[PDB]
Amino acid sequence: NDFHFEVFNFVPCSICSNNPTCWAICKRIP
C-alpha cells in the first residue's frame, strides 16, 4: 500500500463545532 499522509492524518468534522476554519478542512465521516 502506498502511504499518503492525509489518509492517516485528517481532522474529523465532529470536533469542529462552530469554528469555520476547522469546517473548511475537516473530513465528514459516514
Partner: antibody
Framework: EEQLVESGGGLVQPGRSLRLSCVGS????????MHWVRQAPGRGLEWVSG????????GYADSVKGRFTTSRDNAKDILFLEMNTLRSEDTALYFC?????????????????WGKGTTVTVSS | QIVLTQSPATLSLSPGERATLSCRAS??????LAWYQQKPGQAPRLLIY???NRATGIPPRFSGSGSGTDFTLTISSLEPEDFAVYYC????????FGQGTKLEIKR
C-alpha cells in the same frame, strides 16, 4: 475518558500463532487511524503496523511483513493484530495507539492515545 | 521506509541546564516529525507534533525545530521530571521511531 485496552497476549511457542485485540472506549472508533507499536525489554519503540479509519490502507514494518495481519471492525470498536510463525525476537510488549497530527492549515489538531499494552512472550 | 538517527545516545546534565537532542532522517520527512517522552514502566507521551507544536500540558521550555533531514528538541531549563528517554518519530513515509536518546541526571 478515552481508553485503548489490549488483550490476547501471553506465552506462545516459536512458530505458533497469536492474535491481539484492542478495544476502544470513550472515542468515535471509526474516526481515527490506528497503530500497533511494540517494545522489547530494555529496547526502543518500533512501529509494527498501521491501518486507516476505513481499513483502506494498511502498512507493516519490514520485520513483520508476510507474517502479521492488521484488521479492524468499526462496528465493535475493535482492532486486531494476527501474528503467525512467531519468533523469539517478537517477544515484546505490544501497544495499541492512535497517533494523528496535522497542522494543515492554520488549524492545529492532534490525537495521541495509547493503551497500557499487552505482553507477548515467544519461547520454548 | 525512513530511518531516524538520534544523538547523543545518552545526555548527562543536571537540572537547570539546557538540553538539545537531535534527530537526523535518512530521507526528507518534510515537517512530519513528532517527539515522544517515555519513563520506565509507562506508555510514551507525545510532546511535539509536526516539528514545533507542543501537545497540551507540555511546558513551553520544550521547543522543537528543523525541517527535512535535521530536527532538534530543545528543553530550555531542565526540570527533574524531564529526565527520561526521548524518541523522534516520522510520519512522512509510514511510521518509524528513532532508537532513542536517554537524558540522565549528571551528579
Amino acid at each position: 475518558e478515552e481508553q485503548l485496552v489490549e488483550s490476547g497476549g501471553g506465552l506462545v511457542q516459536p512458530g505458533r500463532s497469536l492474535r491481539l485485540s484492542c478495544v476502544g472506549s470513550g472515542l468515535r472508533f471509526e474516526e481515527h487511524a490506528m497503530h500497533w507499536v511494540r517494545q522489547a525489554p530494555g529496547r526502543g519503540l518500533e512501529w509494527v503496523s498501521g491501518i486507516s479509519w476505513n481499513s483502506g490502507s494498511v502498512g507493516y514494518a519490514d520485520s513483520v511483513k508476510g507474517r502479521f495481519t492488521t484488521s479492524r471492525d468499526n462496528a465493535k470498536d475493535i482492532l486486531f493484530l494476527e501474528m503467525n510463525t512467531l519468533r523469539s525476537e517478537d517477544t515484546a510488549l505490544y501497544f495499541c495507539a492512535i497517533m494523528v497530527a496535522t497542522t494543515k492549515n492554520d488549524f492545529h489538531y492532534y490525537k495521541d492515545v495509547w493503551g497500557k499494552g499487552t505482553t507477548v512472550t515467544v519461547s520454548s | 521506509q525512513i530511518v531516524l538517527t538520534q544523538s547523543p545516545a545518552t545526555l548527562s546534565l543536571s537540572p537547570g541546564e539546557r538540553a538539545t537532542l537531535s534527530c537526523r532522517a535518512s530521507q526528507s520527512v518534510s515537517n512530519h516529525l513528532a517527539w515522544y517522552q517515555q519513563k520506565p514502566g509507562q506508555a510514551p507521551r507525545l510532546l511535539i507534533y509536526e516539528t514545533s507544536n507542543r501537545a497540551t500540558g507540555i511546558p513551553p521550555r520544550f521547543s522543537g525545530s528543523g525541517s527535512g533531514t535535521d530536527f532538534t528538541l530543545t528543553i530550555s531549563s531542565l526540570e527533574p521530571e524531564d529526565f527520561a528517554v526521548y524518541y523522534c518519530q516520522q510520519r512522512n513515509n509510514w511510521y518509524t521511531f528513532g532508537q532513542g536518546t536517554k537524558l540522565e541526571i549528571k551528579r
